[PDB]
Coordinates of C-alpha atoms (C1' of nucleotides) and ligand atoms in Angstrom, one line a residue:
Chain A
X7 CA 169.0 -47.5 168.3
X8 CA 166.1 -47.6 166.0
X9 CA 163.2 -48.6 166.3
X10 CA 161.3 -51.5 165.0
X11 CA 160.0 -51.5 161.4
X12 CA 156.6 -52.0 159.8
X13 CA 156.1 -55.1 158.6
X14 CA 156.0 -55.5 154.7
X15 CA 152.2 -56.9 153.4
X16 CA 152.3 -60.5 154.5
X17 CA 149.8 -63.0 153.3
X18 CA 148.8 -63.5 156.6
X19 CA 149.7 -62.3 160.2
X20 CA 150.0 -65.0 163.0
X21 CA 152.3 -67.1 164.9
X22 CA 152.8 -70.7 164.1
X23 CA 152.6 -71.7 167.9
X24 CA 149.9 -70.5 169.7
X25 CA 150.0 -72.2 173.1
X26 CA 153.4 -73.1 174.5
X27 CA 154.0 -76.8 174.0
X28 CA 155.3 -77.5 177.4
X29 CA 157.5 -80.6 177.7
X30 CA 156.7 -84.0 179.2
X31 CA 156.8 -83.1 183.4
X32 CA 158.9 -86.0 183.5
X33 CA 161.6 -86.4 181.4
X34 CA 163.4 -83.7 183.5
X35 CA 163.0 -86.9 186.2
X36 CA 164.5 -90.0 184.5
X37 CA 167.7 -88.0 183.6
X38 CA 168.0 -87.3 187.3
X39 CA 167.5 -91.4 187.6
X40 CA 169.8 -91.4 185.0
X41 CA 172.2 -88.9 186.6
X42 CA 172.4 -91.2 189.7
X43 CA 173.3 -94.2 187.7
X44 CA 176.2 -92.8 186.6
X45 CA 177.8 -91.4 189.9
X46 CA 176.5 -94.0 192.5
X47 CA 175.9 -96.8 190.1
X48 CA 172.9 -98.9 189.3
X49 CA 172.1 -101.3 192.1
X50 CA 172.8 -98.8 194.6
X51 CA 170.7 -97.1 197.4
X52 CA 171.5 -93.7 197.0
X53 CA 169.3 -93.5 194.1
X54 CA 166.3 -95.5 195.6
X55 CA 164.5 -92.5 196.5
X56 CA 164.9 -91.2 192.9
X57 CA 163.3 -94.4 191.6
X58 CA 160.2 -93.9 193.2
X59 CA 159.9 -90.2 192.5
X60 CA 160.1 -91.8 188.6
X61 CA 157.8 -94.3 189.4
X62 CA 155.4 -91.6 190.6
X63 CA 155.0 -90.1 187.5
X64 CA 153.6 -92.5 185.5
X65 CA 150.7 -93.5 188.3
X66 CA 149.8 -89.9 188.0
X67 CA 147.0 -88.8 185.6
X68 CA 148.0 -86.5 182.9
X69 CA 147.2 -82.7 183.0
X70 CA 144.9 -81.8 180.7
X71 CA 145.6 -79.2 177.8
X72 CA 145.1 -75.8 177.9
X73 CA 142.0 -74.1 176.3
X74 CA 143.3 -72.5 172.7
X75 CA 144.8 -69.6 173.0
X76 CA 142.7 -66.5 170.1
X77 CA 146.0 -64.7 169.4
X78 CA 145.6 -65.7 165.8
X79 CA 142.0 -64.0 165.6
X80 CA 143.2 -60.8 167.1
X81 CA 146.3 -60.4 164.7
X82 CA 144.3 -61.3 161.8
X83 CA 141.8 -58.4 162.9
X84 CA 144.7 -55.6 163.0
X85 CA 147.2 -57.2 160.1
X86 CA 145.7 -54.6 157.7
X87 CA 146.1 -51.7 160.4
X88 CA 149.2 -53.4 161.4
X89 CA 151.4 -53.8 158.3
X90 CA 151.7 -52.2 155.1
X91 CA 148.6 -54.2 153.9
X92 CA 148.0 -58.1 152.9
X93 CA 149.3 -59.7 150.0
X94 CA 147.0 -61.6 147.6
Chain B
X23 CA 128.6 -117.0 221.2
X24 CA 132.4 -117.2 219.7
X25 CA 132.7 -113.6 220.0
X26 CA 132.1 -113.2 223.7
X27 CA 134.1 -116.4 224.1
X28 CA 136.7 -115.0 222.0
X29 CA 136.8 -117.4 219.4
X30 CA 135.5 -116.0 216.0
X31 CA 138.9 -117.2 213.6
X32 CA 139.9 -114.3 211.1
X33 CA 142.4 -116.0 208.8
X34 CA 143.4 -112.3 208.2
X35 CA 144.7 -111.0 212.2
X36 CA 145.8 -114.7 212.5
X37 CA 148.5 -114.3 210.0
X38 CA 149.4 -110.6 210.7
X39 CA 150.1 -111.5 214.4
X40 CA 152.3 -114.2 213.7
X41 CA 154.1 -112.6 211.4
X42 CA 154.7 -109.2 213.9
X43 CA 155.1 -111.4 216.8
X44 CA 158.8 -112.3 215.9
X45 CA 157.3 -115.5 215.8
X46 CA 158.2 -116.3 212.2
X47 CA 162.1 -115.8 212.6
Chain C
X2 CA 127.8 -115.7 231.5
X3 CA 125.5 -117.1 229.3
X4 CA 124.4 -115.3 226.4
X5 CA 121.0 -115.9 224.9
X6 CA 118.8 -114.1 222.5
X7 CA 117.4 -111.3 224.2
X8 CA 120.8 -110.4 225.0
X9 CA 123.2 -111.5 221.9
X10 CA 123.5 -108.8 220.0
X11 CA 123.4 -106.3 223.1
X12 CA 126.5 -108.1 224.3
X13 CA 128.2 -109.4 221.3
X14 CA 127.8 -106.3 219.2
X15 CA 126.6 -108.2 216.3
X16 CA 123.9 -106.7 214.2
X17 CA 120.2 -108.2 214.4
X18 CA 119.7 -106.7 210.8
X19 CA 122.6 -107.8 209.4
X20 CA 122.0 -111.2 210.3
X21 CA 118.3 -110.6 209.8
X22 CA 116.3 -111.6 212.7
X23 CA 114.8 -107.9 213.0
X24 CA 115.1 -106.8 209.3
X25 CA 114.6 -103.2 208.3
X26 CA 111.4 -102.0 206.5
X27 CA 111.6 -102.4 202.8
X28 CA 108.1 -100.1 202.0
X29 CA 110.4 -97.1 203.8
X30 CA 114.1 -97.5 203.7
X31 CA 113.9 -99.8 200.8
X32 CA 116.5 -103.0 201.7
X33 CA 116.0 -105.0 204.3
X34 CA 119.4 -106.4 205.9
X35 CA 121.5 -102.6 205.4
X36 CA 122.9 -100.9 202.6
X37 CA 126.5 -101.6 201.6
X38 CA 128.7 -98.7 202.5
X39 CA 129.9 -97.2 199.4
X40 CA 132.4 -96.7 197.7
X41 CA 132.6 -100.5 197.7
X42 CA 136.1 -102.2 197.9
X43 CA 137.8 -102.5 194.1
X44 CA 137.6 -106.5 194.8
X45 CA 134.0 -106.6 194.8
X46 CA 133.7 -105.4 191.1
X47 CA 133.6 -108.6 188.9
X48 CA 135.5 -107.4 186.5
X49 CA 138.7 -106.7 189.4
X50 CA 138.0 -109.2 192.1
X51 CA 141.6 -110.7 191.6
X52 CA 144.9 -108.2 192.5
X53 CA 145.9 -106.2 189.2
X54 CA 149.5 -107.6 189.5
X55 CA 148.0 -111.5 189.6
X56 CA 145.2 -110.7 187.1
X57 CA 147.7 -108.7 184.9
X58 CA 150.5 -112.0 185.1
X59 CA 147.7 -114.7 184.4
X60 CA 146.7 -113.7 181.0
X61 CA 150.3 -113.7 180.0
X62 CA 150.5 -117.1 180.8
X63 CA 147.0 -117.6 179.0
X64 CA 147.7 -118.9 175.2
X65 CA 144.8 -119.5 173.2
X66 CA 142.1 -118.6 174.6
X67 CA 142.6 -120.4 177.7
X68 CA 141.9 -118.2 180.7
X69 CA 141.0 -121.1 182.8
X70 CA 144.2 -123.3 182.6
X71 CA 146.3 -120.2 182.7
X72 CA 144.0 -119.4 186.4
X73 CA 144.7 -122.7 187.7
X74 CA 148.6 -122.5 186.7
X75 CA 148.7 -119.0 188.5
X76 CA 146.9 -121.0 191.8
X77 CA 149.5 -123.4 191.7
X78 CA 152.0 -120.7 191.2
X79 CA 151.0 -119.0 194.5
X80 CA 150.1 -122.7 196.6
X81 CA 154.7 -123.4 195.7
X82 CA 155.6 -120.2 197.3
X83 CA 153.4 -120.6 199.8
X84 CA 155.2 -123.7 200.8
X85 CA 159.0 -122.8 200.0
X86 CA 161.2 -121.9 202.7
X87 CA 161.5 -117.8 203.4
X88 CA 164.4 -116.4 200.7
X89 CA 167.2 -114.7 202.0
X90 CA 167.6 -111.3 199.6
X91 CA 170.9 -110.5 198.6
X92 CA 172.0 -107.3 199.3
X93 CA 173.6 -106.5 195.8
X94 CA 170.0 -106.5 194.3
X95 CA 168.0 -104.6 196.5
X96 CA 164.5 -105.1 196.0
X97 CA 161.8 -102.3 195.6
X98 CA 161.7 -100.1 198.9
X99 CA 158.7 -100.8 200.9
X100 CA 158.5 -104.3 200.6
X101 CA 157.9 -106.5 203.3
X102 CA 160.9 -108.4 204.9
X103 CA 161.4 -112.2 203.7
X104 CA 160.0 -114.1 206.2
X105 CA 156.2 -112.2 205.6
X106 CA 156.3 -113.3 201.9
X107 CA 155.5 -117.3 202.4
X108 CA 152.0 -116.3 203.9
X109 CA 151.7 -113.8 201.4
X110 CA 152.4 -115.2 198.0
X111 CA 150.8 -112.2 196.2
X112 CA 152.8 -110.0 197.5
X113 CA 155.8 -112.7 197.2
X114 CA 154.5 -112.6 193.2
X115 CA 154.3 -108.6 193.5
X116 CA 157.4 -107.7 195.1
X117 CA 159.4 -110.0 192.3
X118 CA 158.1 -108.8 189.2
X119 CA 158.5 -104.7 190.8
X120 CA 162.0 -105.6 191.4
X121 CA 163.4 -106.4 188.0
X122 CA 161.0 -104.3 186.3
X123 CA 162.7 -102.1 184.6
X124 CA 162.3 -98.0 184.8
X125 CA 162.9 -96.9 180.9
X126 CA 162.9 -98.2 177.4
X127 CA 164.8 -97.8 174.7
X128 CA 163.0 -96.3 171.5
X129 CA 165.3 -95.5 168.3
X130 CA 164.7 -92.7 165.6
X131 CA 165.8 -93.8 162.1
X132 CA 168.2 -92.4 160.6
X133 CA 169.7 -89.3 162.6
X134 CA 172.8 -90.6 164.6
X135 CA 175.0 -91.0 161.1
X136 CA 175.7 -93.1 158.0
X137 CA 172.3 -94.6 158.7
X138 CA 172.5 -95.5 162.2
X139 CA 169.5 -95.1 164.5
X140 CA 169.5 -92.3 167.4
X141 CA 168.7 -94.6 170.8
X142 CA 167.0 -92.3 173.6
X143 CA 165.9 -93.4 176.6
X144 CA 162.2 -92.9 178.3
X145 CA 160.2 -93.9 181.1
X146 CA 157.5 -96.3 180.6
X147 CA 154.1 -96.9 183.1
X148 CA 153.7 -99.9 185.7
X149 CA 151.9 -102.0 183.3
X150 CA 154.5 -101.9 181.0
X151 CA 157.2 -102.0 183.7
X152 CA 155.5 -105.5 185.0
X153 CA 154.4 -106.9 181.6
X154 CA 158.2 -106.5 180.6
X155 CA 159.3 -108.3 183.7
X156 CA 156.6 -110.9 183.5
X157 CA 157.8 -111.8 180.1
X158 CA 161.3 -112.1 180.8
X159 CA 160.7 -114.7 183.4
X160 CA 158.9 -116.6 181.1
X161 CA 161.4 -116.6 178.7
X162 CA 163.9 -118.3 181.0
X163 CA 161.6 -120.7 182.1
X164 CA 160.8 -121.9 178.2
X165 CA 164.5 -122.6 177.6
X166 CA 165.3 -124.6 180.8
X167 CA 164.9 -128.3 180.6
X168 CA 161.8 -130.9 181.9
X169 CA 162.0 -132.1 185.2
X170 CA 158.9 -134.5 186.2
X171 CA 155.6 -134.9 185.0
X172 CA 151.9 -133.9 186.3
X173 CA 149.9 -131.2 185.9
X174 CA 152.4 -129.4 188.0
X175 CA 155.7 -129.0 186.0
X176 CA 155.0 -125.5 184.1
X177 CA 153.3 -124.2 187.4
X178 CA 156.2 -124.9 189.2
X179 CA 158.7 -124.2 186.9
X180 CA 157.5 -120.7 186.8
X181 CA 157.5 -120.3 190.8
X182 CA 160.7 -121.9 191.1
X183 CA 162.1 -118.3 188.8
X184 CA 160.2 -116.1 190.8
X185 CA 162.1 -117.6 194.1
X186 CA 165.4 -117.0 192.0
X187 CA 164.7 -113.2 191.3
X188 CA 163.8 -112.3 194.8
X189 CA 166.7 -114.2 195.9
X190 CA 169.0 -111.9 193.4
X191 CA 170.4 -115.2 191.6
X192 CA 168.1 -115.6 188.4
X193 CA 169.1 -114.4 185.0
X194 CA 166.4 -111.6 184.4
X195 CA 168.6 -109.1 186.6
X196 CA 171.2 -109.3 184.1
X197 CA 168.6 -108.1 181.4
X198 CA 167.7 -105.2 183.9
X199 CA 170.8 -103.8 184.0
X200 CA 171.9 -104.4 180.7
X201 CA 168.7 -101.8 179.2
X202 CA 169.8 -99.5 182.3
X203 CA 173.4 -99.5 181.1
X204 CA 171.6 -97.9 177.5
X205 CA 169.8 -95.8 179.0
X206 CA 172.9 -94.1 181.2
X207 CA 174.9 -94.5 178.2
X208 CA 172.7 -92.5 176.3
X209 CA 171.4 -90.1 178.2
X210 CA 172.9 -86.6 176.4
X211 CA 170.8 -88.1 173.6
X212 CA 167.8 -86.4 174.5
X213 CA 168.9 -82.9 173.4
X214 CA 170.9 -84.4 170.7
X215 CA 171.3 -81.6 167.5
X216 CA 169.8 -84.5 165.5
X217 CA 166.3 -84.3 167.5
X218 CA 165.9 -80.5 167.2
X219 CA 167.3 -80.3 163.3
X220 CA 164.8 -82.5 161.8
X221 CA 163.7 -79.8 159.2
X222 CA 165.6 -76.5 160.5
X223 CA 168.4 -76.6 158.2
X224 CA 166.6 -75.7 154.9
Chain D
X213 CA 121.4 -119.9 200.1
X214 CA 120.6 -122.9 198.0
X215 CA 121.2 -122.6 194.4
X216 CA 120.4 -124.8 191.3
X217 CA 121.2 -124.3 188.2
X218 CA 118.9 -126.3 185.4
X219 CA 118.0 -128.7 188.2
X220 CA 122.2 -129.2 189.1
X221 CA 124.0 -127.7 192.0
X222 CA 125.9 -124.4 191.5
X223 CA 129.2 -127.5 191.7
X224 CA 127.7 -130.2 189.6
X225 CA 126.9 -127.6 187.0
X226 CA 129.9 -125.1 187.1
X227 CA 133.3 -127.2 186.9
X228 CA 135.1 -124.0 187.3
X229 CA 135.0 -122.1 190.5
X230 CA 135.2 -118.7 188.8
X231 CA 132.3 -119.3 186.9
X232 CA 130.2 -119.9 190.1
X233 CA 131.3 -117.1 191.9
X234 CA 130.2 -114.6 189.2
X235 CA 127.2 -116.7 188.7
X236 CA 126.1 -115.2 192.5
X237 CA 128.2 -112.2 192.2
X238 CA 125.4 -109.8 192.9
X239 CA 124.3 -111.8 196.5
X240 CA 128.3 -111.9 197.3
X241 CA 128.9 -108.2 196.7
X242 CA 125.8 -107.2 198.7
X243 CA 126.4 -110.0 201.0
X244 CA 123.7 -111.9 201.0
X245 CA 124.2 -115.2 199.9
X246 CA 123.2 -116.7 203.2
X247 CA 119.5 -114.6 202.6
X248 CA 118.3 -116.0 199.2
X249 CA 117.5 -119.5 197.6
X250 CA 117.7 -119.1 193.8
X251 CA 116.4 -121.5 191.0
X252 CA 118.0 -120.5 187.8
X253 CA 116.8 -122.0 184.5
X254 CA 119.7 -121.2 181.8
X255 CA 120.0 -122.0 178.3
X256 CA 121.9 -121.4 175.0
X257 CA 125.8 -120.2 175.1
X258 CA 128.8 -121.7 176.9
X259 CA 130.2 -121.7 180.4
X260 CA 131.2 -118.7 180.9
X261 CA 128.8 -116.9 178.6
X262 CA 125.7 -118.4 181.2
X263 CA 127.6 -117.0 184.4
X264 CA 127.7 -113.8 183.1
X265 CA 124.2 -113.7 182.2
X266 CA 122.7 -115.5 186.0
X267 CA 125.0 -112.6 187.2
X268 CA 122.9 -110.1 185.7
X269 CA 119.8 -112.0 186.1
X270 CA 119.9 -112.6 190.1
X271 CA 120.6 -109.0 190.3
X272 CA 117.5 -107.8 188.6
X273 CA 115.7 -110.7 191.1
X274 CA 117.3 -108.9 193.7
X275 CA 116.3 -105.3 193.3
X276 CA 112.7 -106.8 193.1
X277 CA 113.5 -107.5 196.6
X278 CA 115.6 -105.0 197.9
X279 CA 115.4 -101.7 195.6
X280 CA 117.8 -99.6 198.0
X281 CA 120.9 -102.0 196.0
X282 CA 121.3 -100.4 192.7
X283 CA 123.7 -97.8 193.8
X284 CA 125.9 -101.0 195.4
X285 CA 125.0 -103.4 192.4
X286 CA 126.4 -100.2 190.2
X287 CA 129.7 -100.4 191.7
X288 CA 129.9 -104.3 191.9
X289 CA 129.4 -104.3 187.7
X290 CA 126.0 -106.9 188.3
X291 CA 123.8 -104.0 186.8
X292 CA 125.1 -103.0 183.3
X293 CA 124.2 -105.4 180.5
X294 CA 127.1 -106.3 178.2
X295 CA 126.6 -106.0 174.9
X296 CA 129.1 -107.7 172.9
X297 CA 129.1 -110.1 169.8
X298 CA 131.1 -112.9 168.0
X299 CA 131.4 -110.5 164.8
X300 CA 130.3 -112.2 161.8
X301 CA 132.1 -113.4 159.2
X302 CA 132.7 -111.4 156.1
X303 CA 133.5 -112.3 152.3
X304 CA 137.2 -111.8 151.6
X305 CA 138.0 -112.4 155.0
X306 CA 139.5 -115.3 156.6
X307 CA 137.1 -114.5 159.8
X308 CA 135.0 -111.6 161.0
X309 CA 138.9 -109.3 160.6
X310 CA 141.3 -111.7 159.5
X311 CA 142.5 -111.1 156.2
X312 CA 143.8 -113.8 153.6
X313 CA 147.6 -113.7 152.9
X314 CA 147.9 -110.4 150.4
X315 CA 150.7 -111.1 147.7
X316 CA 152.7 -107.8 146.4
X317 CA 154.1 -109.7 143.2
Chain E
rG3 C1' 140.7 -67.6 162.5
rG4 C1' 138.6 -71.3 165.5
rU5 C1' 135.9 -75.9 166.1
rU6 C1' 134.3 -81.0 164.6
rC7 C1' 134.5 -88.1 163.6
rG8 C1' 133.5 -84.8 159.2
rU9 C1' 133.5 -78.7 153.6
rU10 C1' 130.6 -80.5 160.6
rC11 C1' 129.3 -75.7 163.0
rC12 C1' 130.5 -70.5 164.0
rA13 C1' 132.9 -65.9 162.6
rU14 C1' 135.0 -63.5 158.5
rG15 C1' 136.7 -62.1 153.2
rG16 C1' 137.2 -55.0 148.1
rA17 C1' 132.2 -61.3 145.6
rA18 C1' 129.4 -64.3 146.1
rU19 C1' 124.3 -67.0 145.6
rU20 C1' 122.8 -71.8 144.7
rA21 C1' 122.2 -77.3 142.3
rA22 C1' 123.5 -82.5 141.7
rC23 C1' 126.5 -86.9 143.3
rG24 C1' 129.5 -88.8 147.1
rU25 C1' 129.3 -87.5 152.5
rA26 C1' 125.6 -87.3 156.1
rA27 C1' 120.8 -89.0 157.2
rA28 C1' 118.1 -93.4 156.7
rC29 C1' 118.1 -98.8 156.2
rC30 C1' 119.6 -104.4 157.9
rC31 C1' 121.6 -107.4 162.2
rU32 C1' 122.6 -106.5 167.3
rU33 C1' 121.5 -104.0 172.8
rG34 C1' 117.4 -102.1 176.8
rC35 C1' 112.3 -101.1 177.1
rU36 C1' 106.8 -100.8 175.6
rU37 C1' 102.5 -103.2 173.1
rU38 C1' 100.7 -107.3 170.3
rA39 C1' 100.5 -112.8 169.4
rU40 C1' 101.0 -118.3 172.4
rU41 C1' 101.8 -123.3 168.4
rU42 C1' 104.8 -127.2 166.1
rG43 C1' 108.3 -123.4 171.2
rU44 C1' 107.7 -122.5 176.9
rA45 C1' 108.5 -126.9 184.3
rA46 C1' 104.7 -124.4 186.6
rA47 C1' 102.2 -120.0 186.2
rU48 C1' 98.7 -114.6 188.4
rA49 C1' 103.5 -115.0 181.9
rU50 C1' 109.5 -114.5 182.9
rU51 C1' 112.8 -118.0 178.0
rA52 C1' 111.9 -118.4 172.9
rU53 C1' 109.5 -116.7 168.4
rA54 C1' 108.6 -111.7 165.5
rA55 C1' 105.5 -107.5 164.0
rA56 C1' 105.3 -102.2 165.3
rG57 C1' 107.0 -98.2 168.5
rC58 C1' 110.6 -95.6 171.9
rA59 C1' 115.8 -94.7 173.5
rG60 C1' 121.9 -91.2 174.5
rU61 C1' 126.0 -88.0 174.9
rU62 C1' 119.7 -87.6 177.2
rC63 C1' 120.1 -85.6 182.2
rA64 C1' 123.6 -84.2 186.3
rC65 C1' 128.7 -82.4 187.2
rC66 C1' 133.0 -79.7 185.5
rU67 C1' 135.2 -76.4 182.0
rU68 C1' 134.2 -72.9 178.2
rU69 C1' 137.5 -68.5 172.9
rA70 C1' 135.9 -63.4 169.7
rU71 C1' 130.5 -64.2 173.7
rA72 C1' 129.4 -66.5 168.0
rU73 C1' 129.6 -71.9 167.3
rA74 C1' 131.4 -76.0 172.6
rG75 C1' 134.3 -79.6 175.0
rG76 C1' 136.0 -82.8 179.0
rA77 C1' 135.7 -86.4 182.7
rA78 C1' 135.0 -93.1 181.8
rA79 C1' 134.5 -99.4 187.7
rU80 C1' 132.8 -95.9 192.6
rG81 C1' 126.5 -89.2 189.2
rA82 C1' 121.8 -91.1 187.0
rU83 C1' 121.0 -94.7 183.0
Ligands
K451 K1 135.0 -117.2 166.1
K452 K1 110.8 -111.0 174.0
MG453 MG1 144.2 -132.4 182.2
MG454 MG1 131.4 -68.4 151.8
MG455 MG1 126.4 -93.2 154.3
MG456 MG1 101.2 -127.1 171.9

RNA sequence: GGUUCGUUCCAUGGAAUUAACGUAAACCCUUGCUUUAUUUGUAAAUAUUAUAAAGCAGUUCACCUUUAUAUAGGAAAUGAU
């Protein structure tokens, strides 16, 4: 196995997502709502306690983001030392 | 002199008793 | 056991200050008949004295400007349920766990008002991106949607229903009532408004594989 | 825990009970309706427009009285002054936003 | 590369340093407060509505968080105001 190669010059070095969009905590929830509906039906009471879990979500505040993450400003300090150069 | 007498109404217990005494059916 | 001055407030717990006969010293502690405890109730703010489920249903009766006819409506709203007889809940549509049983609702007509509109509220909504599920169609995916859109979708429903029925008397009372009378019929499970809650669940169990459809992750990926 | 309003009772005056109520919020949130006689002079705006503004005026008669009720007065919403406006209107405008019917032909 | 309502601010570039206009600032109405004035307005008055000249005021302080340590941001009816 080889290993990896030296980047060609690039006209900048970053990536294009920084911090990890995380998904909305509760859309994992309604398709387990969902899920219920179609095995035990709709006006069931098997998924009653499901219901309220969903309902739960939206009385909750939402997190707050993340502070930004500098990756960018470190690979734009070592691109040069990095790669094979920068392109202009 | 209702509250040593016991009889200070409060429209709120009046209603929660009847309603947890069975009373209501 | 006669009570009297000297000895009311020792024997009837009351407080002299509270009812001012020795008041406190306003040059030291600053009031003079006790400081609220704090945090104060929600219901003392003026701008949330009324429950957010009463307050929240009112102004969607209002039209026009007209808070205070759209207030009295909602008083005579609460004053019929408070004198119809007790429902009796159907068991095929169960109501929101937690609620009181049938007979507490009478004396309680905001919870009566509450427990309807949390009932056929639904739990998702349908929202449609253009143009991804073929020759033109729309891609329909399901999502959840907070409590004041779950009652303000409810809310309007019933008032749809009640528009379309037909007059019955005359007064100041036929609107008023003609709302109340729906709210008895949705906590009874025989109105019409269940049938529009299921029929938006139905989408949303129908379509939920949509939400990793190769549509919604290939928007500008195939280059 | 008389009131008058412009000479009138808080009943003869107010025709609408939730105007009367926030008229005297400040004494009802502190409870003390039953300690004060106020004589309020209004004037100018409408019905509801005057409650809102005894509210705020018995509240600053209050603290006069009792200073140790800002923090509850806070929290009851007697304290803040609210400062909105009918927008004026504005040429090309049907009122202060609403815009004439725009023609694409 | 970050940040900001914003070519705003910070850092940086084997090329930059500055000017004008727009922007911004300021101005007008409005909000709280201070002083002045009291008729043709104000029930009385030991002056508080109204009238109108000037001045002051905010994202200011507190709390929380905070990158490259350089420039900051958040919370919103239950800190102050
Ligand atoms: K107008
Ligand atoms: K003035
Ligand atoms: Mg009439
Ligand atoms: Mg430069
Ligand atoms: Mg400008
Ligand atoms: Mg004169």
């Amino acid at each position: 196995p080889n290993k990896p190669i030296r980047l060609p010059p690039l006209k900048q070095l970053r990536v294009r997502q920084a911090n990890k969009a995380e998904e909305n905590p509760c859309i994992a929830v309604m398709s387990s709502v969902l899920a219920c509906w179609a095995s035990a039906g709709y006006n069931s009471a098997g998924c009653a306690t499901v219901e309220n879990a969903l309902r739960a979500c939206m009385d909750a505040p939402k997190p707050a983001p993340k502070p930004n993450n500098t990756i960018n400003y470190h690979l734009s300090r070592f691109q040069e030392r990095l790669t094979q150069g920068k392109s202009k | 002199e209702k509250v040593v007498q016991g009889a200070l109404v409060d429209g709120a217990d009046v209603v929660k008793q009847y309603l947890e005494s069975g009373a209501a059916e | 056991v006669e009570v009297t001055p000297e000895n009311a407030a020792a024997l009837s717990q009351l407080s002299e200050i509270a009812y001012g006969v020795k008041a406190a010293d306003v040059a030291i502690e600053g009031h003079k008949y006790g400081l609220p405890t704090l945090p104060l109730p929600s219901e003392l703010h003026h701008k949330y004295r009324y429950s957010e489920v009463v307050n929240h249903a009112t102004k969607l009766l209002m039209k026009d400007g007209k808070l205070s006819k759209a207030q009295r409506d909602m008083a005579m709203i609460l004053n019929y349920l408070r004198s119809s007889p007790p429902p009796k809940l159907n068991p095929s549509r169960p109501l929101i766990p937690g609620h009181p049983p049938a007979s507490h609702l009478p004396l309680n007509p905001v919870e009566y008002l509450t427990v309807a509109i949390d009932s056929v509220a639904p739990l998702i909504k349908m929202r449609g991106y253009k143009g991804l599920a073929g020759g033109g169609r729309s891609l329909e995916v399901p999502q959840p949607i907070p409590a004041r859109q779950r009652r303000s979708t409810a809310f309007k429903w019933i008032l749809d229903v009640v528009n379309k029925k037909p007059s019955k008397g005359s007064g100041r009372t036929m609107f008023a009532h003609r709302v109340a009378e729906e709210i008895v019929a949705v906590v009874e499970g025989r109105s019409s408004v269940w049938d529009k809650r299921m029929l938006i669940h139905k989408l949303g169990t129908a379509n939920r594989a949509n939400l990793n459809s190769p549509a919604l992750q290939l928007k500008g990926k195939r280059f | 825990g008389e009131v008058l309003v412009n000479g009138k009772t808080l009943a003869e005056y107010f025709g609408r009970v939730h105007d009367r109520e926030s008229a005297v919020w400040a004494l009802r949130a502190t409870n003390r309706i039953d300690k004060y006689n106020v004589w309020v002079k209004v004037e100018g705006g409408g019905t509801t427009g005057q409650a809102e503004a005894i509210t705020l005026a018995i509240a600053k008669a209050l603290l006069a009285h009792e200073p140790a009720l800002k923090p509850a007065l806070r929290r009851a919403g007697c304290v803040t002054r609210d400062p909105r406006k009918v927008e004026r209107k504005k040429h090309g405008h049907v009122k202060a936003r609403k815009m004439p019917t725009w023609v694409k032909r």
